[PDB]
Design a protein around this ligand. Structure first.
Ligand SMILES: *[C@H](C)[C@H]1/C(=C/C2=NC(=C\c3[nH]c(C[C@H]4NC(=O)C(C=C)=C4C)c(C)c3CCC(=O)O)/C(CCC(=O)O)=C2C)NC(=O)[C@@H]1C
Ligand SMILES: *[C@H](C)[C@H]1/C(=C/c2[nH]c(/C=C3N=C(/C=C4\NC(=O)C(CC)=C4C)C(C)=C\3CCC(=O)O)c(CCC(=O)O)c2C)NC(=O)[C@@H]1C
Ligand SMILES: C=CC1=C(C)[C@@H](Cc2[nH]c(/C=C3N=C(/C=C4\NC(=O)[C@H](C)[C@H]4CC)C(C)=C\3CCC(=O)O)c(CCC(=O)O)c2C)NC1=O
Ligand SMILES: C=CC1=C(C)[C@@H](Cc2[nH]c(/C=C3N=C(/C=C4\NC(=O)[C@H](C)[C@H]4CC)C(C)=C\3CCC(=O)O)c(CCC(=O)O)c2C)NC1=O
Ligand SMILES: C=CC1=C(C)[C@@H](Cc2[nH]c(/C=C3N=C(/C=C4\NC(=O)[C@H](C)[C@H]4CC)C(C)=C\3CCC(=O)O)c(CCC(=O)O)c2C)NC1=O
Ligand SMILES: C=CC1=C(C)[C@@H](Cc2[nH]c(/C=C3N=C(/C=C4\NC(=O)[C@H](C)[C@H]4CC)C(C)=C\3CCC(=O)O)c(CCC(=O)O)c2C)NC1=O
Ligand SMILES: C=CC1=C(C)[C@@H](Cc2[nH]c(/C=C3N=C(/C=C4\NC(=O)[C@H](C)[C@H]4CC)C(C)=C\3CCC(=O)O)c(CCC(=O)O)c2C)NC1=O
Ligand SMILES: C=CC1=C(C)[C@@H](Cc2[nH]c(/C=C3N=C(/C=C4\NC(=O)[C@H](C)[C@H]4CC)C(C)=C\3CCC(=O)O)c(CCC(=O)O)c2C)NC1=O
Ligand SMILES: C=CC1=C(C)[C@@H](Cc2[nH]c(/C=C3N=C(/C=C4\NC(=O)[C@H](C)[C@H]4CC)C(C)=C\3CCC(=O)O)c(CCC(=O)O)c2C)NC1=O
Ligand SMILES: C=CC1=C(C)[C@@H](Cc2[nH]c(/C=C3N=C(/C=C4\NC(=O)[C@H](C)[C@H]4CC)C(C)=C\3CCC(=O)O)c(CCC(=O)O)c2C)NC1=O
Ligand SMILES: CCC1=C(C)/C(=C/C2=NC(=C\c3[nH]c(/C=C4\NC(=O)[C@H](C)[C@H]4CC)c(C)c3CCC(=O)O)/C(CCC(=O)O)=C2C)NC1=O
Ligand SMILES: CCC1=C(C)[C@@H](CC2=N/C(=C\c3[nH]c(C[C@@H]4NC(=O)C(C)=C4CC)c(C)c3CCC(=O)O)C(CCC(=O)O)=C2C)NC1=O
Ligand SMILES: CCC1=C(C)[C@@H](CC2=N/C(=C\c3[nH]c(C[C@@H]4NC(=O)C(C)=C4CC)c(C)c3CCC(=O)O)C(CCC(=O)O)=C2C)NC1=O
Ligand SMILES: CCC1=C(C)[C@@H](CC2=N/C(=C\c3[nH]c(C[C@@H]4NC(=O)C(C)=C4CC)c(C)c3CCC(=O)O)C(CCC(=O)O)=C2C)NC1=O
Lengths: 52, 164, 160, 362, 161, 177, 177, 148
């Protein structure tokens, strides 16, 4: 059982804010895969935790 | 590669001439000696494994000191590397044997070998024990044809006389 | 673990845990700090057990480190001592678990199929684990090395 | 000039041994005047003293005066090459129709067999010509000690392929300066002056325009296998090759990272492996022709094709992981060269379109 | 399942037709290649253990997978892994000797992608192990028979991917 | 420069395995072929000058812009350079005929040619035309169907060889463009 | 080619002023150091060939691709050229040790080496690996902590000079890539 | 892009870390364009409608900037432009006013991308960037043709 706290495609567009493009800006450099792994592993949580 | 037709066309190219009858007679002798040494090539491709095996086994049968640690050969890897080196040498005898002449063999095996072998504490007398073992274990009529065997002899001796 | 085994058995019988089994869990959870002492000592003395056990293994059994053998060479001998390190570590897991379920499921279930798929004589593996048993019994007390040494004996019984 | 001159000039000035190792084998030969009836050193000597430029009979009559003495054998090879250089043909091909910078660089190319070393030698020969003129400069060329060390008095000058190249830009500039085998030296701009002033590597693709061809390379030079297209298609293929090279470089960094991660973990067990006393079945002593491979069957050739082929360890297997990615990265690094070659050639076609006048004058 | 013969009788049967010259040309093709497939199946039957050992040695050992954390790290999971390589070799031999990969559809590829994606078997490593068996097997049986085995191992790899 | 032999040898060295029978079998035919190649090379190298004269003459005939003033063949010197360039091309082609492999042609003559003619402004289409005329003339002599000179040879089949020669000239004509 | 003296002099020329006492004081620390650098260069140049052998052999050991037919190391010619290249690299590094400044190393080897190896197809990561092994072996000789050879020297502190030598090998290894 | 890279990313970082500047710039200049589009009955007159106006400016510049990373405005076409003019007609939104605001955003974008905008003088080594400027103006007049 995995819960995936998953952002939409329009959420990554929200990343353009100078603040967000400053923070996640260097992930568009080509070598950075383990950092993307860290971010995306931060979105997935074991067990089942939904609404109620 | 140094060979018949590359010596003649290299000479005609350096000279700037059309190919006259001299180069034609050279390639005539290439195509006439060919059958013999190609037969030797066939049989070398036949039993190369046992050639390398008897070569290296008789090589350490003569030089037992190599096995002692701190010497050139002492690790499953080192003796393995001995066999690989010998195997490369017989394959280059097969290539030069098929080509004809010493051009293929000289530029791959001989050129620059002195630095390598002198650098890496590699004695040539072990190789020469291997090749003279193969040349003494050769045969006159039983395995090959005599005439082609002479060609085999020549190439192997060339390696010896390029080594020490 | 002993607790896990008891619970599973109780679950299978679809009943509560018996008096007896709860008494046993009590004896286990009171024996805890002694176990953690044992696995502490085998933890902090692992290099002597692996090295010295490997020495006694290769001195008793000159087959596998001979040329022709499975462990011939520096890298193969290093892989051999790597596996002795594995078994030594599992034995520590089996000591703190109070049951050989970690030892069995991490290391023993299907071991013969693996080492037969590697070309390794598994009797040499059992002789290696016996050598580490002798060293580990040299590093402990009487009753202490009786207990830990009997975990090693379980691994020997699984290899043979 | 009177300034300290750095480097060793041409090493080969002692110890001719490094001609065996380098690309000098796959040159044809030098023409050595050894026996009588020479007939060859004249031909290769006129081949290199000019820039493979076509000379007719009416223009060989200009230096036939120097050719006579040398066919007789009265003068040497050095004095013959010198008398060729003083002739009007060499003035007409190289001095009279070409600007000076290219002319000095071609004097280095033909005479000494190498590119210029520095700005220092170059300005030195500017001073030699400014103080003494044409003849005095050519005398300064043939009267070098480096010439008399290497070329002697019986060999015609050849392009030199020593082992070291104490400036590496000497090697790059001599491979740039020489063209191909079938490359004549006419209508050509100053090649080396940009690389001479404020030292830079000249190009990546141009260097291998000057090398003699190797038979067995581990990557074939993919010339004449590139498909035909317009420029921007080729530049796009350049951009694709660069991106793929970036991906492969990051992949190799991952590969070395993983290898050091396993090796630093396993080195302790390697130290215990060096600790042990481990003795062979018959290893300590015993002279009985021991069997090195008692698990061979009939066809195995266990040693393998490379020696470390059959062997695999904890740290040997990631080397086999590395070598593949190394090979593919070298493939595409050889692709970038030929792509830039095609872009440079087609661009040179764009600068000078070949035009023929259509109607005859009758 | 079905071999090449049965498949021809299926198409000719489902048309209602008899066997015409085209279908007999297909059966002649299979009956020409018959003996080659037989000796290939003989060699692979002889050396199955060595195929799996050399292919696991090429593809799977001394990597992240048999290191702790990887899916082959324990002896239980090692033995299950080499068990599965055994099945891929055996059914690839049946598919070679039938001349029709329908057996691989029926008895291998059925439910196995659901299984591996359920348990956490990495598909990539599995595919590379099967390709290692393809190279080792082709080295044993030779060129032609190695091409035949190559289409069936590639069939399994196309199934799991 | 690698000939038939050296091509097989190089391939086997990259493969790092002995050449064996297969490669020896193709080689045997090359050897078994032999004198057809010898006599072929004799035919083209015999009438070589005349081939070069006729081909370049034809090439000037199709487009007279070359000999028109400002064209690349206008000067006597440029006409002579033209002729000797065609001669040298035919010379290397004959070298590639005796060799059996185009490695002499690739290394000695093809390496730096396009760049040279681009640097000198030589029209490449005209060169491929002249290479084509030397191709036809050379195949006509090589099949002994030449309309001027028809010399006696022991008869047989020499089509293979003609295909080889046509391949060499197609290599050069593809190269110059 | 500029030593530490010429570097101080060139830096004083950039500002067009006399060197002065401060720079002379640091120069007295350099010259007062002296025979530490002498004995250090004597250590590396003593065991030089053995450094080169071990480093290149280890470099072949880490990636087997060079050994197999394909890689430059395969065959005697290429192995010889590999050994002399490691030798030349170590030579220039020892030049930079006597000099005290990397000027001799930067112009001679660093400026145009990467393009040269790219033009020849030499794999650059293998070269940086070899430069790294020569670095570790050279620092181990320079600290006299080599596990096979330990000669008697009057003790002292030579850590900063080890840092200098490691900086020159990091300059070469950074340059080749 | 492997040639552009830090330069194209540099341009995107120039347009992105001036976003509030360009948006409030062009919308305030849109209001100071016409007094009829601030007065009563105007879409912007309501407090809520002004907020959605600023949001629409930010969204246009956001997808336009995003395209500048993504090379072609497929990202923009699928969500940002797909179904625009039909909405602005169906809600009574003036289109000439939006076209003017997109033009002002375009001019401010190019003036930021060439540093000719007096007031922001971020330090970059100089280069040629005209092609990329024409891609930026290319995107703004793609959208500026789509609003009308
Ligand atoms: C005749 C059909 C052409 C013609 C030929 C010309 N080539 C000229 C000069 C030149 N050509 C080369 C290449 C050539 N020389 C070689 O030795 C080899 C191969 C071994 C080749 C492929 C070079 C290097 C040179 C420069 C040296 C020289 O002048 O001989 C040439 C002179 C003027 C020019 O550049 O065009 C001519 C005329 N040119 C023509 O227009 C017709 C079609
Ligand atoms: C080995 C190369 C790879 C690998 C394999 C692996 N497999 C399993 C478990 C199972 N595999 C099967 C497979 C089949 N069942 C079939 O009917 C057929 C067709 C004939 C096949 C191929 C099944 C049923 C199981 C589970 C139960 C059982 O086997 O009896 C495991 C176990 C994983 C676990 O956690 O249990 C593993 C590890 N592992 C690798 O990493 C390799 C790529
Ligand atoms: C193309 C032809 C060709 C060859 C002929 C070989 C020759 C050769 N051998 C070695 C290298 C070696 N060769 C041997 C072999 C020996 N072991 C002994 O006990 C005997 C004296 C001897 C076998 C008879 C060993 C042991 C090494 C490794 C030496 C070492 O690292 O100490 C090396 C250095 C690179 C390497 O480590 O592999 C080279 C170039 N290589 C080639 O490319
Ligand atoms: C490709 C190269 C190649 C070689 C160089 C030979 C070398 C060679 N010869 C023999 C084996 C042999 N070689 C000979 C030959 C003869 N012994 C005599 O006393 C006669 C003088 C001489 C014939 C003139 C004999 C008789 C044997 C078998 C017994 C023996 O070892 O002498 C063997 C062992 C395998 C076998 O029994 O056939 C090998 C590897 N084989 C090869 O494939
Ligand atoms: C710069 C001035 C200058 C000269 C004056 C000549 C002088 C000269 N002539 C010859 C060489 C020659 N000169 C002649 C000439 C002669 N034939 C006869 O019947 C007559 C006796 C005589 C003409 C009157 C001949 C025939 C040769 C060749 C001799 C031979 O090879 O046998 C040679 C040797 C080199 C060669 O073979 O060309 C030289 C140096 N050369 C020069 O460089
Ligand atoms: C003054 C400084 C100086 C250098 C640094 C070298 C650099 C250098 N190396 C080579 C040439 C070479 N260098 C190598 C070396 C390599 N073999 C491999 O397997 C590795 C990738 C690599 C060692 C790490 C090889 C193999 C050649 C010959 C290449 C060939 O001919 O294919 C050449 C061309 C001339 C020659 O053949 O020697 C030059 C200039 N030379 C100099 O003068
Ligand atoms: C040194 C110079 C030199 C030559 C010029 C050749 C000439 C030559 N050709 C052949 C032999 C041959 N030459 C040809 C060639 C021909 N096939 C045809 O269709 C055409 C008529 C013709 C090519 C134009 C053929 C076919 C044979 C074999 C004839 C036969 O066996 O029937 C032979 C007899 C030996 C042999 O079979 O090879 C000789 C000496 N050989 C030399 O050593
Ligand atoms: C012409 C050749 C030549 C040499 C080879 C040196 C050799 C040398 N070194 C020292 C002197 C010294 N050499 C060292 C070097 C060392 N530091 C260590 O940690 C290592 C063991 C070792 C470097 C590998 C040190 C530390 C001193 C000073 C020792 C002290 O004062 O305690 C001295 C005494 C004079 C002095 O203090 O400088 C001399 C003669 N000098 C020369 O004239
Ligand atoms: C993660 C965030 C991130 C960025 C924001 C960029 C920032 C960036 N820009 C350049 C580099 C550059 N940036 C520009 C940009 C321009 N110069 C002009 O004069 C124009 C005003 C402007 C138009 C856009 C230029 C021209 C260069 C140098 C040329 C080039 O590197 O292509 C470099 C190269 C390294 C350096 O210069 O030190 C980097 C990293 N890259 C990133 O990774
Ligand atoms: C993904 C892309 C995307 C867009 C581009 C916008 C487009 C958009 N704008 C509005 C809605 C609106 N947009 C504006 C904007 C305007 N005010 C004016 O004075 C000008 C004419 C204009 C700015 C230039 C206003 C005022 C509204 C609200 C209209 C109203 O309720 O009357 C709506 C209806 C939903 C809402 O009320 O927010 C939508 C879909 N939304 C999106 O999801
Ligand atoms: C935690 C439970 C567990 C164990 C035990 C385990 C063992 C294990 N042993 C291996 C190899 C090996 N193991 C040995 C062991 C020995 N050789 C001898 O002669 C001796 C008898 C013995 C040492 C005492 C050798 C030689 C190899 C490598 C053999 C080869 O690769 O050819 C491998 C192959 C790949 C790799 O090691 O990474 C595994 C996975 N894996 C596990 O998950
Ligand atoms: C008016 C401007 C003009 C020319 C000049 C010719 C030139 C010419 N010769 C050809 C081809 C050609 N040329 C010859 C050589 C020639 N023939 C002989 O029999 C003898 C003895 C020869 C030298 C004296 C041969 C042998 C052929 C092959 C055709 C044939 O069988 O005759 C071809 C055909 C090319 C092709 O096939 O692609 C051409 C164009 N044509 C022209 O339009
Ligand atoms: C199996 C493939 C393989 C090799 C080949 C070696 C190569 C090797 N030598 C090293 C390092 C190294 N090598 C030597 C030189 C060497 N030692 C001596 O005592 C004498 C006489 C020498 C030449 C004959 C020294 C002196 C060191 C420093 C470590 C030490 O003190 O021994 C290091 C450590 C590198 C580092 O510190 O980053 C490596 C990797 N290692 C491998 O895994
Ligand atoms: C009196 C009513 C009134 C306004 C309100 C302005 C609004 C305005 N800004 C413009 C254009 C404009 N505006 C800015 C943004 C702005 N400048 C900056 O340097 C910073 C930091 C900014 C946000 C604070 C830029 C960067 C430009 C581009 C011109 C330039 O280079 O400055 C343009 C030109 C439009 C065009 O080119 O078509 C106008 C009309 N004009 C008016 O008449």
């Amino acid at each position: 059982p995995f819960t995936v706290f998953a952002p939409t495609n329009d959420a990554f567009t929200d990343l353009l804010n100078a603040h967000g493009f400053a923070s996640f800006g260097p992930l568009l450099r080509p070598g950075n895969t383990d950092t993307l792994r860290d971010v995306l592993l931060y979105h997935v949580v074991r067990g089942t935790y939904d609404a109620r | 590669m140094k060979s018949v037709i590359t010596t003649t066309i290299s000479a005609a190219d350096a000279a700037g001439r059309f190919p006259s009858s001299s180069d034609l007679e050279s390639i005539q002798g290439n195509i006439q000696r060919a059958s013999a040494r190609l037969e030797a090539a066939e049989k070398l491709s036949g039993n190369h494994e046992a050639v390398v095996k008897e070569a290296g086994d008789a090589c350490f049968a003569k030089y037992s000191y190599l096995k002692n640690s701190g010497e050139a050969g002492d690790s499953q890897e080192k003796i393995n590397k001995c066999y690989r080196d010998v195997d490369h040498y017989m394959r280059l005898i097969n290539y030069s044997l098929v080509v004809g002449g010493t051009g293929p063999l000289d530029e791959w095996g001989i050129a620059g070998s002195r630095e390598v072998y002198r650098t890496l504490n590699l004695p040539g007398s072990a190789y020469i024990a291997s090749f003279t073992f193969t040349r003494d274990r050769l045969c006159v009529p039983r395995d090959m044809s005599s005439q082609a065997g002479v060609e085999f002899v020549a190439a192997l001796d060339y390696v010896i006389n390029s080594l020490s | 673990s002993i607790v896990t085994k008891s619970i599973v058995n109780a679950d299978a019988e679809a009943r509560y845990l018996s008096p007896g089994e709860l008494e046993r869990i009590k004896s286990f959870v009171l024996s805890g700090q002694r176990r953690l002492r044992i696995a502490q000592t085998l933890t902090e003395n692992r290099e002597m057990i692996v090295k010295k056990g490997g020495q006694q293994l290769f001195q008793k059994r000159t087959d596998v480190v001979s040329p022709g053998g499975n462990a011939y060479g520096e890298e193969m001998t290093a892989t051999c001592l790597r596996d002795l390190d594995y078994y030594l570590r599992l034995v520590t897991y089996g000591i703190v678990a109070g049951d050989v379920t970690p030892i069995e499921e991490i290391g023993l279930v299907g071991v013969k199929e693996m080492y037969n798929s590697l070309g390794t004589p598994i009797s040499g593996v059992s002789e290696g684990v016996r050598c580490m048993k002798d060293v580990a019994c040299s590093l402990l007390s009487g009753e202490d090395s009786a207990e830990a040494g009997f975990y090693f004996d379980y691994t020997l019984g699984a290899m043979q | 000039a009177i300034e300290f001159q750095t480097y060793s000039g041409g090493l080969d000035r002692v110890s001719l041994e490094p001609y065996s190792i380098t690309r000098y084998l796959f040159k044809p030969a030098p023409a050595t005047v050894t026996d009588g009836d020479k007939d060859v050193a004249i031909n290769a000597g006129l081949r290199q003293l000019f820039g493979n430029a076509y000379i007719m009979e009416e223009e060989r009559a200009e230096f036939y005066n120097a050719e006579s003495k040398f066919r007789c054998g009265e003068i040497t090879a050095r004095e013959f090459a010198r008398a060729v250089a003083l002739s009007n043909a060499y003035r007409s091909r190289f001095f009279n129709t070409v600007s000076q910078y290219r002319f000095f660089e071609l004097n280095f190319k033909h005479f000494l067999g190498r590119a210029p070393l520095n700005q220092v030698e170059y300005s030195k020969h500017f001073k030699i010509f400014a103080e003494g003129g044409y003849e005095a400069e050519i005398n300064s060329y043939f009267d070098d000690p480096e010439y008399d060390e290497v070329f002697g008095d019986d060999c015609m000058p050849f392009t030199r392929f020593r082992g070291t190249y104490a400036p590496i830009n000497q090697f790059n500039r001599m491979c740039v300066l020489e063209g191909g085998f079938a490359m004549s030296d006419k209508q050509r701009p100053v090649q080396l002056m940009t690389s001479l002033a404020a030292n830079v590597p000249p190009a990546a693709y141009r260097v291998v325009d000057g090398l003699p061809a190797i038979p067995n390379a581990e990557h074939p030079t993919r010339k004449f296998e590139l498909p035909n297209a317009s420029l921007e298609r080729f530049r796009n293929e350049v951009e694709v090759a660069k991106a793929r090279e970036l991906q492969l470089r990051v992949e190799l960094k991952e590969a070395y990272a993983k290898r050091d991660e396993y090796r630093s973990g396993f080195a302790g067990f390697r130290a215990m492996a060096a600790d042990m006393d481990i003795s062979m079945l018959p290893g300590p002593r015993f002279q009985g022709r021991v069997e090195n491979y008692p698990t061979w069957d009939g066809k195995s050739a266990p040693w393998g094709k490379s020696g470390v082929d059959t062997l695999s360890g904890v740290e040997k297997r990631p080397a086999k992981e590395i070598a593949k990615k190394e090979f593919q990265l070298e493939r595409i690094k050889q692709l970038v060269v030929d792509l830039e070659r095609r872009v440079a050639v087609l661009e040179a076609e764009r600068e000078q379109p070949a035009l023929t006048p259509e109607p005859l004058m009758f | 399942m079905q071999d090449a013969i049965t498949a021809v009788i299926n198409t000719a049967d489902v048309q209602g037709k008899y066997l015409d010259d085209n279908s007999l040309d297909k059966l002649r093709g299979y009956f020409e290649t018959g003996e080659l497939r037989v000796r290939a199946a003989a060699t692979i039957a002889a050396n199955a253990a060595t195929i799996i050992k050399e292919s696991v040695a090429k593809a799977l050992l001394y990597s992240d997978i048999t290191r702790p954390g990887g899916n082959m790290y324990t002896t239980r999971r090692y033995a299950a892994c080499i068990r599965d390589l055994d099945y891929y070799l055996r059914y690839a031999t049946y598919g070679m000797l039938a001349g029709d990969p329908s057996i691989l559809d029926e008895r291998v590829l059925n439910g196995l992608k659901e299984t591996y994606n359920s348990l956490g078997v990495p598909i990539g490593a599995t595919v590379q192990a099967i390709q290692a068996m393809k190279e080792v097997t082709a080295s044993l049986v030779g060129t032609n028979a190695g091409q035949e085995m190559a289409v069936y191992f590639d069939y399994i790899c196309s199934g799991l991917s | 420069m690698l000939d038939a032999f050296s091509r097989v040898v190089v391939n086997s060295d990259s493969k790092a395995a002995y050449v064996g029978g297969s490669d020896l079998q193709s080689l045997k035919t090359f050897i078994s072929d032999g004198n057809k190649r010898l006599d072929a090379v004799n035919c083209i190298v015999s009438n070589a000058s005349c081939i070069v004269s006729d081909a370049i003459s034809g090439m000037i005939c199709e487009n007279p812009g070359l000999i028109a003033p400002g064209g690349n063949c206008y000067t006597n010197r440029r006409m002579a350079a033209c002729l000797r360039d065609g001669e040298i091309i035919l010379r290397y082609v004959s070298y590639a005929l005796l060799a059996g492999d185009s490695s002499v042609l690739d290394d000695r003559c093809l390496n730096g040619l396009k760049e040279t003619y681009i640097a000198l402004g030589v029209p490449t289409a005209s060169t491929s035309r002249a290479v084509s005329i030397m191709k036809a003339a050379s195949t006509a002599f090589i099949m002994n169907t030449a309309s001027g000179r028809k010399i006696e040879i022991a008869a047989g089949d020499c089509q293979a060889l003609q295909s080889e020669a046509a391949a060499y000239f197609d290599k050069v004509g593809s190269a110059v463009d």
